[PDB]
């Protein structure tokens, strides 16, 4: 119960503690070494937030998308953890990101613009 406290828990139980992980991301010798870390953390946080913003999911911990897909959800959400999920599905994440960038967001902007 704390930072990374649901690392071993099932994905369904781990999805309830999003905020505790999301909160800790932002925050001479050892005079510049602290500055390097200070800049690096901000850079990484901004990059992740930009990636969320491009997909239309800005400011949302649990977003819904418009990209369609074995692997029944019953075994995935009840019998696995996020780490095994990552090891299994890390191969396709680049193509999923590429689909999410423009297949469903820029289009939605076009229909919203043309509607009004």
């Amino acid at each position: 119960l704390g930072f990374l406290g649901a690392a071993g828990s099932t994905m369904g139980a781990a999805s309830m503690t999003l905020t505790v992980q999301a909160r800790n991301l932002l925050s001479t010798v050892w005079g510049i070494k602290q500055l390097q870390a200070r800049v690096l953390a901000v850079e990484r946080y901004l990059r992740d937030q930009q990636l969320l913003g491009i997909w239309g999911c800005s400011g949302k911990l649990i977003c819904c998308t418009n990209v369609p897909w074995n692997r029944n959800l019953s075994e995935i959400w009840d019998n696995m953890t996020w780490l095994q999920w990552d090891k299994e599905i890390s191969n396709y994440t680049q193509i999923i990101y590429g689909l999410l960038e423009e297949s469903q967001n820029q289009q939605e902007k076009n229909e919203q613009d043309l509607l009004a």
Binding site: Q21, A22, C57, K60, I62, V67
Partner: peptide, 8 residues
């Protein structure tokens, strides 16, 4: 099924 995004 549809893909989703989790941030934490």
């Amino acid at each position: 099924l549809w893909v989703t995004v989790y941030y934490g």
